[PDB]
Structures are given as structure tokens and as C-alpha cells.
Amino acid sequence: PRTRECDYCGTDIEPGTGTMFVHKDGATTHFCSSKCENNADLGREARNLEWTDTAR
Amino acid sequence: PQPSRPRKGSLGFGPRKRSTSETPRFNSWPSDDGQPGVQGFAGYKAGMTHVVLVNDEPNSPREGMEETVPVTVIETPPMRAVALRAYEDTPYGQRPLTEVWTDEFHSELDRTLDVPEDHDPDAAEEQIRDAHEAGDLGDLRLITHTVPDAVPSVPKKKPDVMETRVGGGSVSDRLDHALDIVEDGGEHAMNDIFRAGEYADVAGVTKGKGTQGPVKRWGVQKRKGKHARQGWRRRIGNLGPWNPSRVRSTVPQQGQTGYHQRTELNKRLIDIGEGDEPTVDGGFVNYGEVDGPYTLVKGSVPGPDKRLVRFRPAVRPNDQPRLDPEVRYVSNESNQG
Amino acid sequence: MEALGADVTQGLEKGSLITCADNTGARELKVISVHGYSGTKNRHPKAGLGDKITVSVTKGTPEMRRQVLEAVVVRQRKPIRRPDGTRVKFEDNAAVIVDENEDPRGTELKGPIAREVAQRFGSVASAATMIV
RNA sequence: UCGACCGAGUGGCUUGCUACCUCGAUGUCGGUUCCCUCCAUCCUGCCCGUGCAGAAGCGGGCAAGGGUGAGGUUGUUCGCCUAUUAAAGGAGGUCGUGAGCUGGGUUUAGACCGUCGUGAGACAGGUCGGCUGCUAUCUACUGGGUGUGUAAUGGUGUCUGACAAGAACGACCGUAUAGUACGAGAGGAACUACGGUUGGUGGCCACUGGUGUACCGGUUGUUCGAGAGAGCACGUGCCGGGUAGCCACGCCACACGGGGUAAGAGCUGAACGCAUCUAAGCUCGAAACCCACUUGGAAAAGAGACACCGCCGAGGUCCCGCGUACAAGACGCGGUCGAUAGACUCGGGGUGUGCGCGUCGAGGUAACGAGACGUUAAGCCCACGAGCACUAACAGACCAAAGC
RNA sequence: GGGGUUAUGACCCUCUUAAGGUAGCGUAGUACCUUGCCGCAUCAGUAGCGGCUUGCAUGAAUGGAUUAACCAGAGCUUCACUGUCCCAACGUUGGGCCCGGUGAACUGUACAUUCCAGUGCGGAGUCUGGAGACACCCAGGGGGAAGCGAAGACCCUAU
RNA sequence: GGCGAAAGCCAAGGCCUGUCGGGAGCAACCAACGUUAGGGAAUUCGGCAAGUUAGUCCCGUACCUUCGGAAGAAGGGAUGC
Ligand SMILES: [Cl-]
Ligand SMILES: [Cl-]
Ligand SMILES: [Cl-]
Ligand SMILES: [Cl-]
Ligand SMILES: [K+]
Ligand SMILES: [Mg+2]
Ligand SMILES: [Mg+2]
Ligand SMILES: [Mg+2]
Ligand SMILES: [Mg+2]
Ligand SMILES: [Mg+2]
Ligand SMILES: [Mg+2]
Ligand SMILES: [Mg+2]
Ligand SMILES: [Mg+2]
Ligand SMILES: [Mg+2]
Ligand SMILES: [Mg+2]
Ligand SMILES: [Mg+2]
Ligand SMILES: [Mg+2]
Ligand SMILES: [Mg+2]
Ligand SMILES: [Mg+2]
Ligand SMILES: [Mg+2]
Ligand SMILES: [Mg+2]
Ligand SMILES: [Mg+2]
Ligand SMILES: [Mg+2]
Ligand SMILES: [Mg+2]
Ligand SMILES: [Mg+2]
Ligand SMILES: [Mg+2]
Ligand SMILES: [Mg+2]
Ligand SMILES: [Mg+2]
Ligand SMILES: [Mg+2]
Ligand SMILES: [Mg+2]
Ligand SMILES: [Mg+2]
Ligand SMILES: [Mg+2]
Ligand SMILES: [Mg+2]
Ligand SMILES: [Mg+2]
Ligand SMILES: [Mg+2]
Ligand SMILES: [Mg+2]
Ligand code: NA
Ligand code: NA
Ligand code: NA
Ligand code: NA
Ligand code: NA
Ligand code: NA
Ligand code: NA
Ligand code: NA
Ligand code: NA
Ligand code: NA
Ligand code: NA
Ligand code: NA
Ligand code: NA
Ligand code: NA
Ligand code: NA
Ligand code: NA
Ligand code: NA
Ligand code: NA
Numbered sequence A: 001p002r003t004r005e006c007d008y009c010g011t012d013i014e015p016g017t018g019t020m021f022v023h024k025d026g027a028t029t030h031f032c033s034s035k036c037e038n039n040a041d042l043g044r045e046a047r048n049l050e051w052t053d054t055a056r
Numbered sequence B: 001p002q003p004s005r006p007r008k009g010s011l012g013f014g015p016r017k018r019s020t021s022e023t024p025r026f027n028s029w030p031s032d033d034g035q036p037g038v039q040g041f042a043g044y045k046a047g048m049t050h051v052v053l054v055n056d057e058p059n060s061p062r063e064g065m066e067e068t069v070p071v072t073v074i075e076t077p078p079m080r081a082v083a084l085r086a087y088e089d090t091p092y093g094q095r096p097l098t099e100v101w102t103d104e105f106h107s108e109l110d111r112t113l114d115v116p117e118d119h120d121p122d123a124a125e126e127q128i129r130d131a132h133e134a135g136d137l138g139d140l141r142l143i144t145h146t147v148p149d150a151v152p153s154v155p156k157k158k159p160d161v162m163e164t165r166v167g168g169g170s171v172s173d174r175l176d177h178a179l180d181i182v183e184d185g186g187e188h189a190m191n192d193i194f195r196a197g198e199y200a201d202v203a204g205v206t207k208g209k210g211t212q213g214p215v216k217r218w219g220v221q222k223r224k225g226k227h228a229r230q231g232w233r234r235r236i237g238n239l240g241p242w243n244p245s246r247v248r249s250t251v252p253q254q255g256q257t258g259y260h261q262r263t264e265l266n267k268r269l270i271d272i273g274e275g276d277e278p279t280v281d282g283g284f285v286n287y288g289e290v291d292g293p294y295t296l297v298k299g300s301v302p303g304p305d306k307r308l309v310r311f312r313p314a315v316r317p318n319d320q321p322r323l324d325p326e327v328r329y330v331s332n333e334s335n336q337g
Numbered sequence C: 001m002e003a004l005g006a007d008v009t010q011g012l013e014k015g016s017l018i019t020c021a022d023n024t025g026a027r028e029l030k031v032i033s034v035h036g037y038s039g040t041k042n043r044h045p046k047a048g049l050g051d052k053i054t055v056s057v058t059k060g061t062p063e064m065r066r067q068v069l070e071a072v073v074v075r076q077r078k079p080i081r082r083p084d085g086t087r088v089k090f091e092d093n094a095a096v097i098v099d100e101n102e103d104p105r106g107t108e109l110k111g112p113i114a115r116e117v118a119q120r121f122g123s124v125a126s127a128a129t130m131i132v
Numbered sequence D: 001u002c003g004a005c006c007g008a009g010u011g012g013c014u015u016g017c018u019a020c021c022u023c024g025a026u027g028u029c030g031g032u033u034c035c036c037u038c039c040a041u042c043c044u045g046c047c048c049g050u051g052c053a054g055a056a057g058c059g060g061g062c063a064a065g066g067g068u069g070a071g072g073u074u075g076u077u078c079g080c081c082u083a084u085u086a087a088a089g090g091a092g093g094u095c096g097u098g099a100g101c102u103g104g105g106u107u108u109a110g111a112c113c114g115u116c117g118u119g120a121g122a123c124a125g126g127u128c129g130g131c132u133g134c135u136a137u138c139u140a141c142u143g144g145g146u147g148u149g150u151a152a153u154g155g156u157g158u159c160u161g162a163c164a165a166g167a168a169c170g171a172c173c174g175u176a177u178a179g180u181a182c183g184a185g186a187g188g189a190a191c192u193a194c195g196g197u198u199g200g201u202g203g204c205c206a207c208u209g210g211u212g213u214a215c216c217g218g219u220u221g222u223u224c225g226a227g228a229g230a231g232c233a234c235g236u237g238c239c240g241g242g243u244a245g246c247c248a249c250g251c252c253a254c255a256c257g258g259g260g261u262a263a264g265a266g267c268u269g270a271a272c273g274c275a276u277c278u279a280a281g282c283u284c285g286a287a288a289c290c291c292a293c294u295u296g297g298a299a300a301a302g303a304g305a306c307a308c309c310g311c312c313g314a315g316g317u318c319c320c321g322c323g324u325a326c327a328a329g330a331c332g333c334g335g336u337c338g339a340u341a342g343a344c345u346c347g348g349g350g351u352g353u354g355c356g357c358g359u360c361g362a363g364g365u366a367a368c369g370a371g372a373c374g375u376u377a378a379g380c381c382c383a384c385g386a387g388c389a390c391u392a393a394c395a396g397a398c399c400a401a402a403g404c
Numbered sequence E: 001g002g003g004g005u006u007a008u009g010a011c012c013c014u015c016u017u018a019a020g021g022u023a024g025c026g027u028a029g030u031a032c033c034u035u036g037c038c039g040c041a042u043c044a045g046u047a048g049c050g051g052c053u054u055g056c057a058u059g060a061a062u063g064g065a066u067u068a069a070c071c072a073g074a075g076c077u078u079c080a081c082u083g084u085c086c087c088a089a090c091g092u093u094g095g096g097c098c099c100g101g102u103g104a105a106c107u108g109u110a111c112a113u114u115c116c117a118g119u120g121c122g123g124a125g126u127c128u129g130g131a132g133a134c135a136c137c138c139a140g141g142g143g144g145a146a147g148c149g150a151a152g153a154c155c156c157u158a159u
Numbered sequence F: 001g002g003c004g005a006a007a008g009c010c011a012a013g014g015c016c017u018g019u020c021g022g023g024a025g026c027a028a029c030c031a032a033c034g035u036u037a038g039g040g041a042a043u044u045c046g047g048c049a050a051g052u053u054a055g056u057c058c059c060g061u062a063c064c065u066u067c068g069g070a071a072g073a074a075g076g077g078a079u080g081c
Helices: A034-041 B121-134 B171-183 B214-218 B225-229 C122-126
Strands: A019-022 A028-031 B041-054 B066-075 B079-090 B093-101 B137-145 B161-167 B199-205 B210-212 B255-257 B261-275 B292-298 B308-313 B327-330 C017-020 C026-034 C052-060 C068-075 C087-090 C094-098
Touching (some): B041 B261, B041 B292, B079 B121, B121 B171, C026 C068, C026 C094
Parallel strands (some): A019 C087
Antiparallel strands (some): B199 B308, B210 B255
16 A cells, blocks of 8 residues: 555545546646645635645 | 336235344355354444454455544443253244353343243253253253443443354254353354454344335435426325226335344354453544443444344355454544534 | 446436547537436436447537447546445546447547446547546 | 148237126227236347357247346337347237326317318318316325333343245356367357356445535626625625535445255156066256345244343333434433533644735826735635533422232 | 320310419328338437329419518427436425324115126126135225216117 | 616514314325436427526627517626725
8 A cells, every 4th residue: 555645635545535636638637635635626725725745 | 108116115024014133134044064153243333433444355456555444333242141052843843941040140131031030950951962862952042131231322222132143063062062151141243253354144134214205215216307396206106007906015015114133144253352342532433432342243233232242153255254354443432523 | 248346327318418439520410329227118228337328419520420330438427436445436437439439439539437437438638648 | 950731739919709897987099107917038048959070050848036228110919120239039917007297198178181072061181279176085006103012020132934025146258178179161159167247136435527696716787975885686796616414426234055746867667577767766956936135023822932130120111412323203312430411721623814904006186096015824604523610401290020 | 074286295176064274382281002112310310391193182363383581389409408217215395003082975776795607687705516704893096896977979779 | 785666685553354173204106396317399289388598898790671679589708895
């Protein structure tokens, strides 16, 4: 079980959970949760969200 | 003209009514090929988590690689085989002959039975052996029960009592094997009957839904399009043709749904442990925390959390046992969130 | 067919309009049928990642339009499940036109392909720029 | 393989004939939904023949277990057409199904066109519009209770299995076999062993997804003087996020094998010294039958078995705290020798950084000032878990094993 | 209608019965054959539109053709949209369910626990043969009582 | 408030008499609704029902036409404090 960081909030993604979104250009984003995907979909940047490990 | 399509729901699980016994009763038992041994066990459902596993299937292209597998955690403390029952073969089939009881009892067992103060085991045992000599002896099973007081997450101290067959060996060796177990006080474990990687059949009484309609209960369609706005939404078209002029039991109708006995085949035992390894942060939701003897079952098991479930060795396995599969990871992540 | 090595929730139906990701000159494809697929009463024939589908060209060059061809679905928005449990989903739904031999009709693919599509069609994987 | 003429039939799905039933009314066509069936079999299983090399077929036999799907025109049935498919069979059930739905067509009252008529009007010709009542007495079934019988001694717990239900599984693609057998070549199998898909089935909720008028935040209008904090805006004002649970779009599981047969392939074998698969006997052989497996099942009137407890007392009901249960009833657990529910605290979660104060802030003499940063992973909140007898499970009440 | 003689068509006739369809429009809200034929459009279009058109049975105030604007008028196509559909789920409010109070109606020859077959005025809970069936009660969705409701509007008959 | 005798909210004034209540996370089923991933009319006689769009300002606006219209055509941008 290789542990990965969520490319959005930065917490460690629990093994056997979460979703990878493949972008149009082939770039790849691993999300730990729906909350993060949805926050991203609003065009919010994680560094600007105080609850986020990235921002902290 | 009217495309065909299969009927709604199976007719093999009927009548769909409330189970008379919340403790499931096995309809069948595995064959006698092996050495003498008790043919089942029981425990209490806790919840679900997942596991990372090493693929041991020799026929998979992924063999050796890691796989995520869902698991239902079941608390499986030791049980007590408190008596040995013998069945006589008769023209009417099998009938109980007599029983050999222990004198040694768990403190809570009187919440269920009227416990023997006076019993003569040797007389019973003699009656049995005489039967065997006559060749009338048809079956050997143990009257067993659980110890829910050993499972704090489960509110009951009252034990569940179930009869489990003893198979294997010659009849004589089997008889002795049974008697040996009982005399001790009958204490035995999940370890003793099952090994990780083996297939078990798991029986249980399902989550109760109370009264439900044919859409949920039988999987019939909802009314469609304009039909759905007319005053009918969840009702079937008709209860039958003009003739026969009566409603057939085969037409899907509302009624009790859930709280039925189910026996689910070929459940792989992933691990048989003890301790808090499987337990989830925050506690299993609506259950509690697991620290103690446990069994991990691949996938799902019938029943709600706290429900008694029963194990037996698979009577019709599709696959060879691959023993003791390697567990790389067990998720303790909160089931809340 | 050969196992995909992934569980798919089909995200497409008969009639769905999807992207043709390739240089064939077909831009938009309309799903018509799914290879090897049989449904049930009232069920819309469903297709997804790794399926071979019969297809109709709705948008593109005059010569490609109205043509009925075969294709392979290389991307879908509805998630799929990989053996480690994680889900993968794409930005669009996309298919690639293929001949009777499952060789791409075009010389180039546009955008990413799902890894599992290699377990099925080698020629399509080969022509891929990126595989995820 | 196709098969004329003529001859003999079977069905009761079309059409016609009859006028026996109903005119104090048995609601139409088509469709839909839901159930059962038939076989003259479209696919699937097992076979036979071939103008059977193989592959692909064609024709036939047994066989109704399962399947037989999605669309474009048309009210259509029918039929035509498209792409899929193993195949996309055909019938019966008041041309099954309006106290179920629909109401596009036929066939009311309005109107137009064509034709016919002096005309009112007509057509079986076309066309636009044109309504769908009822609180279920009986019966039937799906589920849920209360009683009685079994029982001139009750109870607790565990079983048995007469019978009953199931399709609990059906089908396809791919790989190895194998570019092999076969074949000049082109082309191109199988037994078996694997992997997956589809349709059906039963269950489950760690994962993904939906909901989530629990909750948290943002914000518009207005009212409570401002601030703070709130009400209303349809049963959340709107927008963003979303715990538990419930769910499917998510996840798990769902057969070997044996027995007896059909068609068929044979063995031994007469009648008929030979021959003969059949007459007696036997070996095999279908997705079909039986068993296996799952579900129900002591009211099985032969109304069952076992062990213990009890007949002044076993056990049960009521009561009280609850919920693995639930429309009433039922069911299950706990009741101080106790973690059953609540409080509290912690854990585990949701939201996203509270009020107030300090600093900054485009500017403005000033007053004033939208907003930024800090204090502050803050504040607020939880359907879950643990610790914990602090509160409440108190007090109790009752039935209970009949007579000569 | 029937006959003589350079797209639509031309002219002369005959017969009935006065004339013999001009300009147009045309498979029409008029076309039986009919899903006419060709084309557009669609994977596929008895639809729709355009062209053709011998028109079963078009046509000039029985007004012909055509037409901008208008329309809760009839048919068709496209973009957008979406629980109409695939295929259903969860939630909200009022009912439904239990309790106190109030409290009708429809309907009723009798009997009635039926089911499979048969028979019968040929469409039976009640006849016949079998099968099944211990009584009572709650909830349900409406298979049957050719269910309830209306002396059939259709059709014929009535001096 | 805003264009408004519009909506929404609130005074004055009126009312709790559009007059039966109590209980069960309150099941099936029904009325009237909200949300629903992916697909997007495949539904159906027919988009029936629902949904989409929306106020104001600037840009810009086709065929056709009885020159009046067509037109808010279409399409694009802006919008608070
Ligand atoms: Cl419907
Ligand atoms: Cl197995
Ligand atoms: Cl298809
Ligand atoms: Cl319909
Ligand atoms: K009549
Ligand atoms: Mg998560
Ligand atoms: Mg209606
Ligand atoms: Mg959870
Ligand atoms: Mg359909
Ligand atoms: Mg009737
Ligand atoms: Mg036959
Ligand atoms: Mg059948
Ligand atoms: Mg009918
Ligand atoms: Mg029918
Ligand atoms: Mg009816
Ligand atoms: Mg009706
Ligand atoms: Mg009614
Ligand atoms: Mg009509
Ligand atoms: Mg019409
Ligand atoms: Mg009409
Ligand atoms: Mg409100
Ligand atoms: Mg708005
Ligand atoms: Mg927090
Ligand atoms: Mg035409
Ligand atoms: Mg045509
Ligand atoms: Mg004139
Ligand atoms: Mg008769
Ligand atoms: Mg009788
Ligand atoms: Mg009359
Ligand atoms: Mg009349
Ligand atoms: Mg409610
Ligand atoms: Mg949706
Ligand atoms: Mg769309
Ligand atoms: Mg359609
Ligand atoms: Mg349709
Ligand atoms: Mg509408
Ligand atoms: Na209605
Ligand atoms: Na309605
Ligand atoms: Na009827
Ligand atoms: Na006839
Ligand atoms: Na009558
Ligand atoms: Na009908
Ligand atoms: Na069959
Ligand atoms: Na059709
Ligand atoms: Na009828
Ligand atoms: Na009808
Ligand atoms: Na009706
Ligand atoms: Na056999
Ligand atoms: Na009994
Ligand atoms: Na005329
Ligand atoms: Na008008
Ligand atoms: Na909806
Ligand atoms: Na009825
Ligand atoms: Na004003």
C-alpha cells in the first residue's frame, strides 16, 4: 500500500479510497474525498482554504 | 408483441415472511471426508472495513500483486459445546435419541435454558453405543451456545443456542471425539474448526424492512411517464388475468420484507485474529469497538450489526482453498465521514 | 473478450453523442450499438470504457458524416474502479474509430487513453500519446 | 435438398357461416403493466442425415429449463426499415389484463374538403376538436395477529420432515489448446483447463455515487434602532459543503457430481440354426426428470422426537429502560448480582476560522469606511462509539399443572 | 364519353345534356390504388418538406392562386433543457396506521372456506366428480362474484 | 422595495372560527413537492408533465415584407459593495 498525498488538500489518502480525475491534457489529479473535488470544481485553490494541510 | 422478460424476483425464497428464529438453522451439513470435527461456529456482526491483500490466485495475471478487498468484521469468541445429541435412523427419518450433557455451565446460560441439576450422562452414552452396535445410529451433533457477555458491543447476556453437526472419521471415532469435547465444559474456538483462506457458508437473519411494496420487495417497475401522474405510482398493473379468477401467489405483492433467514455460500475467510487490529477509529457505527477474537469475511454478510451469524465449511465450494492469504493493510479509518 | 482489469459503470447509451479522439476527420460520434451486448426489456443498450461500439458520424468532414463505423471507447466521465479500489474518471467521453481488425482508422490519437484499453486493443494503445 | 397432382387428417390462432347465450348493458381497438400456460422449437443442450474434408451451412429427431432484447415511420394489430444478438420463435389465458393505467384510432353532439343528393342530409371516403364514475359485503391471494385442537401435568430450550416453492441459475466473448487437426491453397476447428461479460437471483454498505427542509458557512429583500443575534420569503429564500441512516450507479455470493430416461449410439440375443440395439436381459446418452443446494414447514387429526425444569410452583403475561423488531398485534434485549436509555466528559465526525478587541485599509478636515491580517485547525454542530451508576430501569401486580 | 390531327398542349368533331375545365393549384385537411416515384433528412422516417403528377372524385366570389402581420389552431425539423426514459433512490408537508369524541351512504332472494375439471340456455362459490379446507381478527393491492351504478345510446321491431 | 395599485417583508386595524383532537422517525400505499451521478427524448400518438430562459444597460441583429413590420430576431458583453 503506497501512500499518496491528495493533490488538492495534501493529507494522506487512505489506501483503497478516493478518485483520480484525468484532465483533458492528460494531467492527473488524485482526490482524497468528494469535499475536495467539489471545492476544486468551484475554482477554489486549496492554499486559500484554511482547513487544508496545503494552506497550513 | 410484448417482448418477454423474466418475472419479478425469485420464487425460491418464499414465503417471504418473518423468520421464526433469529438464530439461523442450517438446512444442510458438509460431507464426512475429513477427520472428526465440529461442522460449524458462530459470532456477532460488527461492521465493515477494507483490507489490502496479496493476490494468491495462481490463475490471475495479477497474482502476487496487491488488491483492495472489502471485509465484514465478525466477533468470534469461543463457544461452548454443552451437550452431544444422537439421532436414530427410523422409517420416518432421523429422530433425536438421547443427549449427553456436561455438568459445567457458563453463568448466564440459565437466562435461556432450565439447566440440568440432575442428569445421567453414562446412561445416555450407553444408550448411544448400543444404538451404534445395532447400526441404528444416524447422526451426531453438538448442542452449542455463544457467550455474548464476552462481547460488550452486544447488549445481550442471554446466550444463543444452536445445534451443530459433528462430521468426519468413522462413526466410533466421531462419537469419542464429540464426547471428549463436551466433557471439558465444551469450550472451543473459531481456530479449531476454520483456517484463514478457507470458504465458509454464512447464514443469518437479514435486516428487517417491515412492510414494503412490490417495487422494493419484488423489484417490479414504477409506473412510467404519464401513467405515473394518474394516481398510480408504486402499484402493479393487475393482479392477474380474468381467468383463472383468483389471484395467484406468484403475483408480486406488498408484505413483510427483510428479517428472513439466508444462507450465503462460499464466503472466503480472510483472517482469523484476536485483538483490536480490525477495529475502526471512532468505533464501528451503531456497534462499538472490537478487541478480542475476530474473523474477517470477504465481502458482505446477511444481517444488521449485533446480529448472530453462523459459519459452516462450504458444502459446495467452486475453488480450492488457498490458505492464509497475506494481509498487507487493514484500514482503521473512521466509518464516520 | 479479454478481462479489462477494471470494473466499469457504463456511462454511455445507444444514442449518446461522444468525442472522436483521432485525426480521422470525424469529430462527433453517435453510439448506435454495443458489440456482444444483449440488454433486457425497456433497458437502453449501454456502453462504456473498453467496449467496442458501432457508431455513426454526426459531426466532421462531409465524407465522414453519415458513415456507420466501429469504434472503441477510450474515455468516459462516469468513474471506473481499479483493483486497488481507487476510482478513475475522465474529462469527457471519447472513442476512437477502428477497422474490422481493430486497428485505428487514423494515424493519431487526441488526448489520454485509459490503461485498461491496452489489455484489449494493442493497435489503439500503440498509437496513444499518453496512457493513464 | 426442393417437391406438383390427387387422397386422408389435426388445430381452433384468421376469415366466413349460424343466430344458441346476454339488449332492466358481460365497457371498444391498439398500447402498457403483472401473472400462468401451450409446442407445431428461433437460440441454447443431446442427437441423425448430408449434394458431411475443414470452417460455415442445409435438412431432420428428442426436448418447453432458461432466453428471445433496443430503436426510425404508422393510433395501428400487422408490417416495412436500422444497428446490435446465441437467437432477437409463434400461440392461449372474455382476440388475459379500463372496480389497473393510457385514450392515439373506430363511433355522439362543432367544423372543413371530396363525392352523391332538388333538399334535409349521406358516405365508410379523408380531416381538426371533442369526458374515463364507485368509501370492497363475499370470495381470491400477499403479509401480520388472536384463539381452539394435539394435551385427566405444565414449561424451557433444541430438533425431526410429511409435504410445499425455486431458474437459482441461463447465455455469450476471450486466452491456452493452435495458425494445430482438416485442406492444393484459401482458409480453419474440438476435448480440456483458464479469464472475463451479459441477463436473472439473494444479500450488503468498508469503497464510489445519490439523498440527507440533522448540521455548518456564504448571501439578497424586509422587520426587530445600529451592532450582536434573530423571524419570514411554502412548508430549506437562494447558493456552497455534507455526518449517520437508507440506497444503486457501488460491493459480495449464486455448481460440481450422482441417479433414471427421450432422441440417439451400441452389447448380448432369440422368435426365424443366419441376421437383428429388442421381443426377455444389458451398457451408454439431453440445458429436460429425480437427488444434490436454498426457502417454508407440528394442524402432518398417525396433530411428531430429545434433554432438562416443574406440578406450590417451573415458566409466562403485565410493568419499567430500550431496539438487531415493528402500521395495531407481534418480535428481540436490558432491568442494580445493571452500561438499557439520558446527562457529563473524552473519542470519532460535519462545516471552514465565531463575538469582541488590535493592526492595516481606497479615501475623506473630520465624521465615517467596504474589506484584509492576528488572536483562531477557530466558533458552532452530530442520528455514532467509549468512559462513567450522576438521573431514570422504581414500585411492583397477575396467571400458572381441571373432576369419577 | 367516344373520335380526327410542336414542353404544358393545339385545332376540327361526334354523342348525351347547354358547354366540355381556361389561369392556376395538384398524391392535397380533396388521391381509391398508397408507405405512388425521385430527392432532402435520419443508423433506420406509412411522418415532414421539395420536385414529378394521367386529378378513384382539383379549379376560379359553390371564389382560384398566393400572401407580410397575427394565433392557448393542425403537422414536421434543429439548438438549448431536463427524472419523459435507462432505473430508480432519499428526503419534505398532508393523509394513511393506533387512541378519545362525532358519525353517514352505496348495497343485500337465500345459502356461502373454496380450487381444478366436467356439465348445464353453449361464460357455475351453490349441479357432478375429485382436490383442498380448524375458527376469528388486522393491513393491503383490486383476480373473480359475467362486482356496484343506469328498464342499451348501437341494431332491429311498433300500422 | 421597485417601473409599478407587482412580488417579498412590515405597520394601523383584524384574526388564531378557511374550527375536532391525542400518539407512532410516523411502515406499505396515495396527494402536493425538493434533490438526484452518468446518459439526454432512448419515453410517448405527441416533450404530455417538468425543465431551460428571464429584470436593466451597451453592442449587435437574417430570410421575408402590405415598408408599418419581421425584432426583445439571433448572438455577445455588463450588473454587488
Ligand atoms: Cl406504467
Ligand atoms: Cl469456492
Ligand atoms: Cl442496439
Ligand atoms: Cl401507453
Ligand atoms: K346486449
Ligand atoms: Mg472518505
Ligand atoms: Mg387520468
Ligand atoms: Mg461512513
Ligand atoms: Mg418498451
Ligand atoms: Mg365486468
Ligand atoms: Mg415436438
Ligand atoms: Mg416454462
Ligand atoms: Mg381482451
Ligand atoms: Mg397477451
Ligand atoms: Mg379488470
Ligand atoms: Mg373504468
Ligand atoms: Mg375505483
Ligand atoms: Mg381519441
Ligand atoms: Mg388525431
Ligand atoms: Mg380525432
Ligand atoms: Mg421557512
Ligand atoms: Mg434565480
Ligand atoms: Mg472539526
Ligand atoms: Mg411526398
Ligand atoms: Mg415512402
Ligand atoms: Mg365563375
Ligand atoms: Mg358445455
Ligand atoms: Mg364438491
Ligand atoms: Mg331496454
Ligand atoms: Mg339511431
Ligand atoms: Mg409522514
Ligand atoms: Mg440526472
Ligand atoms: Mg443535450
Ligand atoms: Mg421515439
Ligand atoms: Mg417506444
Ligand atoms: Mg408543457
Ligand atoms: Na386518480
Ligand atoms: Na396524480
Ligand atoms: Na375485465
Ligand atoms: Na368462427
Ligand atoms: Na342483463
Ligand atoms: Na387494450
Ligand atoms: Na424451452
Ligand atoms: Na415499429
Ligand atoms: Na370480455
Ligand atoms: Na384498453
Ligand atoms: Na377508464
Ligand atoms: Na446423468
Ligand atoms: Na402439535
Ligand atoms: Na367544380
Ligand atoms: Na384570438
Ligand atoms: Na423528480
Ligand atoms: Na376484486
Ligand atoms: Na411605495
